[PDB]
Design an enzyme around this catalytic site. Sequence first.
Site, PDB file in Angstrom:
ATOM      1  N   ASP A   1       0.830  -1.196   0.000  1.00 17.68           N
ATOM      2  CA  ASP A   1       0.000   0.000   0.000  1.00 17.68           C
ATOM      3  C   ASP A   1       0.865   1.246   0.000  1.00 17.68           C
ATOM      4  OD1 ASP A   1      -2.481  -1.585   0.284  1.00 17.68           O
ATOM      5  OD2 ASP A   1      -1.732  -1.973   2.315  1.00 17.68           O
ATOM      6  N   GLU A   2       2.020   1.186  -0.666  1.00 16.67           N
ATOM      7  CA  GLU A   2       2.880   2.364  -0.681  1.00 16.67           C
ATOM      8  C   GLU A   2       2.315   3.369  -1.667  1.00 16.67           C
ATOM      9  OE1 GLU A   2       3.993  -0.683  -1.130  1.00 16.67           O
ATOM     10  OE2 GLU A   2       5.399  -1.197   0.466  1.00 16.67           O
TER      11      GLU A   2
ATOM     12  N   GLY B   1     -12.881  -2.118   4.781  1.00 14.36           N
ATOM     13  CA  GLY B   1     -13.003  -0.835   5.453  1.00 14.36           C
ATOM     14  C   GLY B   1     -12.117  -0.666   6.682  1.00 14.36           C
TER      15      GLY B   1
ATOM     16  N   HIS C   1      -5.781  -2.135  -6.411  1.00 12.10           N
ATOM     17  CA  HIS C   1      -5.500  -0.712  -6.267  1.00 12.10           C
ATOM     18  C   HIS C   1      -6.137   0.068  -7.408  1.00 12.10           C
ATOM     19  CE1 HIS C   1      -2.613   0.111  -9.503  1.00 12.10           C
ATOM     20  NE2 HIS C   1      -2.047  -1.053  -9.245  1.00 12.10           N
ATOM     21  N   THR C   2      -6.447   1.333  -7.149  1.00 13.09           N
ATOM     22  CA  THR C   2      -7.195   2.149  -8.094  1.00 13.09           C
ATOM     23  C   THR C   2      -6.405   3.411  -8.404  1.00 13.09           C
ATOM     24  OG1 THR C   2      -9.506   1.431  -7.743  1.00 13.09           O
ATOM     25  CG2 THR C   2      -9.162   3.774  -8.140  1.00 13.09           C
TER      26      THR C   2
ATOM     27  N   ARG D   1      -9.104  -0.100   9.279  1.00  9.62           N
ATOM     28  CA  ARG D   1      -7.922   0.777   9.401  1.00  9.62           C
ATOM     29  C   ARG D   1      -6.616  -0.013   9.296  1.00  9.62           C
ATOM     30  NH1 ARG D   1      -8.744   5.981  11.932  1.00  9.62           N
ATOM     31  NH2 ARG D   1     -10.780   6.215  12.982  1.00  9.62           N
TER      32      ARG D   1
ATOM     33  N   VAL E   1       2.940  13.828  -3.643  1.00  6.83           N
ATOM     34  CA  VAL E   1       2.617  14.885  -2.691  1.00  6.83           C
ATOM     35  C   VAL E   1       1.125  15.145  -2.592  1.00  6.83           C
ATOM     36  CG1 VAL E   1       4.821  16.029  -3.137  1.00  6.83           C
ATOM     37  CG2 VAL E   1       2.766  16.753  -4.397  1.00  6.83           C
TER      38      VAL E   1
ATOM     39  N   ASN F   1      -4.190  -9.981  -5.845  1.00 10.32           N
ATOM     40  CA  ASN F   1      -4.157  -9.870  -4.396  1.00 10.32           C
ATOM     41  C   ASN F   1      -3.667  -8.495  -3.960  1.00 10.32           C
ATOM     42  OD1 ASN F   1      -1.565 -10.682  -5.495  1.00 10.32           O
ATOM     43  ND2 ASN F   1      -0.879 -11.288  -3.446  1.00 10.32           N
TER      44      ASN F   1
END
Lengths: 379, 384
Positions: free
Chosen positions: A14-15, A256, A42-43, A258, A368, A39
């Site tokens: 998830d970088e 969902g 990502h969007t 955290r 950024v 697996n």
Amino acid sequence: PEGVTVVLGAQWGDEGKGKLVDILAAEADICARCAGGNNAGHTIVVRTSYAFNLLPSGLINPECTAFIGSGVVVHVPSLFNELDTLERKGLKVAGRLLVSDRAHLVMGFHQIKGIGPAYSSKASRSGLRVHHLFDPTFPAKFRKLMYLAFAERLRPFIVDGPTFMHNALSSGKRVLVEGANALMLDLDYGTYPFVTSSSTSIGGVVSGLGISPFAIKRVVGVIKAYTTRVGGGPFPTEDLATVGETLQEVGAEYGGRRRRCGWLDLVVMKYSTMINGYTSLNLTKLDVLDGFEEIKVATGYKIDGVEVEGFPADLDRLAKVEVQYATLPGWKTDISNCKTYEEFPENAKAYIKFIEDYLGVKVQYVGVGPGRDQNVIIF
Amino acid sequence: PEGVTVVLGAQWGDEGKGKLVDILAAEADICARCAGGNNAGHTIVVREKTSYAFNLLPSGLINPECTAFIGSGVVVHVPSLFNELDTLERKGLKVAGRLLVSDRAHLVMGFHQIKGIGPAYSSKASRSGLRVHHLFDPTFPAKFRIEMYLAFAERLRPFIVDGPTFMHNALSSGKRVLVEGANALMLDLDYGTYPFVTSSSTSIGGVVSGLGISPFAIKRVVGVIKAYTTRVGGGPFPTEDLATVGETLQEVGAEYGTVTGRRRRCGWLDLVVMKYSTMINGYTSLNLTKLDVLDGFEEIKVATGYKIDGVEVEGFPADLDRLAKVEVQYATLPGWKTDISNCKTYEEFPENAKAYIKFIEDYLGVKVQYVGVGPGRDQNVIIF
């Protein structure tokens, strides 16, 4: 740069490598997955949201050919579900998608998501591969524990992987590889057993595309400006109080559920650099630290007072780590609209330089903000 | 070459890579296994003759000042490891104290063997496998669901290192590292004649992965190519000869199973296989072995192409039914009908042995650097 450019997650995932891949895909003829399954969902949002899971996200560049390598494990119905969703969002895919006939298949009984079990059958050499779908004995050896319908839609995508890639390299194509997940989730080198079931690192690219190590030209590590984790096992820089919650909320760090959040850990990054041999770095989500007066960065691990070399395979030892931190002044300003390195605040530059100097690897791209356009190319 | 020199089998194994390793190990600081199990039985003979069997351990140990390393990609059966180690030392070759093992290597357990290499790689993928560091984990008995492995744990302790760090330090301080690939390209889990392959990478990617190093650290990749083709397992074998050519290769090449005694399947040299092999591994040069086995041949055929229904097949087929229907295109080369076993330079080769080498070179586009011309240690030619 003719030859192979590789993009690898450097930490526990998830970088946010999507934006870099998208930037790099604009200068790539081929975009490829080499290993893993569907697996690492990502969007990326473009002028409209495009979901990528099994397919190379480089497909957003319309002139790019997407390639699924032999090292991948493929769930055929998900593949077409994903493809159909993209094309009914106006992105032409079918004429640009090629699949190695040696990639393995994730079956229904594998999901009794199935990635791990598929790689297990592979090691057992009882797994079924893409070419089996056009083998008349397919029904028989399937029973030994609808696809035929999918086989027909799949047929024009099928190629001999080694050949396609060799021809690409020979005719001077620029090939972009999207690593799945990240280094600390690598089957060999991650926090085993809290890892994925295949290579997420640079060797997985060589194996998964069946190419020479000599064809790898660039290896860009994606390093998030702070650390996150999804699974269990230790997490040395994890913060369970206000810092953790600020990273969670400001970084929108949810699946969902955290994500666990912590300071930047350069001990992890040094080990990651050791395994993957990064030629440059993509520092992402730097804006998430815009509101911090002080920023800590893990620079060392000690056990019982003595410096620990490298990263420990034993997780009980990892759990005993005492973290050595550097503390850096924040910049306390909105960098989300910076567009050159020179517009960065002095302490944002210092932060980048600290990372560079520690790791011995230059930072080339800086994310950024959440938008596609919100990046800085340093060189 | 500071950095990594790799030796890979190019066909279906048993190419005889030992003499090459022996040659390269003499100029190597570290000798390493990166992947696979104790699955590639092989021996080295030294001077009045004494034979050393290497299986799990790098045969580079034959050079006394060399350090051996077992990488994280390897799968390790500890009792076999010590059986092999003790036998080498009981023949006067010191191993303990030159041997380092990555604590991330996986363990082949007894229940895996009910050789166990495959099942161990299966547990690895399931992430329920046990690794070397687990032997020093107090929860080892619990998650096992023993007394002998704990005993082995103690003998093992002074060998254990952090694999990534050891190798990184080795490369940083300029050590010359030799990697001995196990088995061969056509037995690779991804790229071989699946399912008739081993259960892991035998190719160059397995080296990068199994030692946890950068692709940039690889300096040489020498492919070992036998002057003819052999196979051990089932599945298709395009240049297989089921008659006299087969039996002659078999007999003159002493192609019998190491422990099984079972004759190997034999066939002509297949360069379609070698072109595909080269494609995966990117050989920087070649070791042509057992060239002397063809010394008595009046004519020698070499496969140069595959056709199916009259149309040329590019590369190598993943589908074995398609492979089985391959019709093989051969070139025929005149033999040299002479004993090449005592040649020691390229120039002493008969004109038609030179032609054979050059034909291989020109076809694959990779130069032949070493030629094995006999069973003896001394019986090879270095071309450049």
